[PDB]
Enzyme design. Structure first.
Site, PDB file in Angstrom:
ATOM      1  N   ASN A 110      -1.225   6.428  -6.726  1.00 42.51           N
ATOM      2  CA  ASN A 110      -2.132   5.486  -7.382  1.00 42.51           C
ATOM      3  C   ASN A 110      -3.166   6.070  -8.336  1.00 42.51           C
ATOM      4  O   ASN A 110      -3.849   7.033  -8.017  1.00 42.51           O
ATOM      5  CB  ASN A 110      -2.814   4.606  -6.330  1.00 42.51           C
TER       6      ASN A 110
ATOM      7  N   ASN B   8      -0.327  -2.576 -10.284  1.00 47.33           N
ATOM      8  CA  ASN B   8      -0.862  -3.377  -9.203  1.00 47.33           C
ATOM      9  C   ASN B   8      -1.772  -4.458  -9.777  1.00 47.33           C
ATOM     10  O   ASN B   8      -2.154  -4.389 -10.940  1.00 47.33           O
ATOM     11  CB  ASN B   8      -1.624  -2.465  -8.240  1.00 47.33           C
TER      12      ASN B   8
ATOM     13  N   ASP C 224      -4.860  -5.030  -9.115  1.00 47.87           N
ATOM     14  CA  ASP C 224      -6.186  -4.509  -9.427  1.00 47.87           C
ATOM     15  C   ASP C 224      -6.149  -3.714 -10.749  1.00 47.87           C
ATOM     16  O   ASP C 224      -7.109  -3.027 -11.091  1.00 47.87           O
ATOM     17  CB  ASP C 224      -6.728  -3.640  -8.283  1.00 47.87           C
TER      18      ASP C 224
ATOM     19  N   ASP D 256       1.042   2.725  -9.998  1.00 50.29           N
ATOM     20  CA  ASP D 256       1.579   3.719  -9.068  1.00 50.29           C
ATOM     21  C   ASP D 256       2.607   4.533  -9.850  1.00 50.29           C
ATOM     22  O   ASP D 256       3.450   3.953 -10.537  1.00 50.29           O
ATOM     23  CB  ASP D 256       2.247   3.042  -7.876  1.00 50.29           C
TER      24      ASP D 256
ATOM     25  N   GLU E 138       9.685   4.064  -1.692  1.00 51.56           N
ATOM     26  CA  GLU E 138       8.606   3.983  -2.659  1.00 51.56           C
ATOM     27  C   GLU E 138       9.188   3.922  -4.061  1.00 51.56           C
ATOM     28  O   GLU E 138       8.812   3.061  -4.860  1.00 51.56           O
ATOM     29  CB  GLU E 138       7.661   5.199  -2.580  1.00 51.56           C
TER      30      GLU E 138
ATOM     31  N   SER F 135      -4.549  -1.023 -11.473  1.00 48.78           N
ATOM     32  CA  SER F 135      -4.152   0.374 -11.362  1.00 48.78           C
ATOM     33  C   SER F 135      -2.616   0.420 -11.386  1.00 48.78           C
ATOM     34  O   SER F 135      -1.969  -0.622 -11.323  1.00 48.78           O
ATOM     35  CB  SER F 135      -4.696   0.981 -10.083  1.00 48.78           C
TER      36      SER F 135
END
EC number: 3.2.1.17
Length: 129
Positions: free
Chosen positions: A59, A46, A48, A52, A35, A50
């Site tokens: 998120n 991301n 969309d 991480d 990750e 958002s």
């Protein structure tokens, strides 16, 4: 901070993650590896909109507030920046809520794609725990 494999495994263990909800320490270390590459300051935006955050790539649409994700639910009640700290406590407490959310560790795409169904025990091999 960029954690070492065994260093991270011991920190997670201390924080009660080993076998939390039935997931071994190997699962959690493997997931952090793919990750964030063990880097607490990792962030990735991301499509969309958002983002991480942290070692476990939590998120902003659901778990934390970064002030720039419309309709964030902030389920962990913390600003996303807290997730980038060298102390992993906030990331761990939040991950505990996520993993209990019903889909388990499948919530983490890297775990699903690179750890699930593999010899995850290898990730803690050699570590004095």
């Amino acid at each position: 901070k960029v954690f070492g494999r065994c260093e991270l495994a011991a920190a997670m263990k201390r924080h009660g993650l080993n076998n939390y909800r039935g997931y071994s320490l190997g699962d959690w270390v493997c997931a952090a590896k793919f990750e964030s590459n063990f880097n607490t300051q990792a962030t990735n935006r991301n499509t969309d909109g958002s983002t991480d955050y942290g070692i476990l790539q939590i998120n902003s649409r659901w778990w934390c507030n970064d002030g720039r994700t419309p309709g964030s639910r902030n389920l962990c009640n913390i600003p996303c920046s807290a997730l980038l700290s060298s102390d992993i406590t906030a990331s761990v407490n939040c991950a505990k809520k996520i993993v209990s959310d019903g889909n388990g560790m499948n919530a983490w795409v890297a775990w699903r794609n690179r750890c699930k169904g593999t010899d995850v025990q290898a990730w803690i091999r050699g570590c004095r725990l």
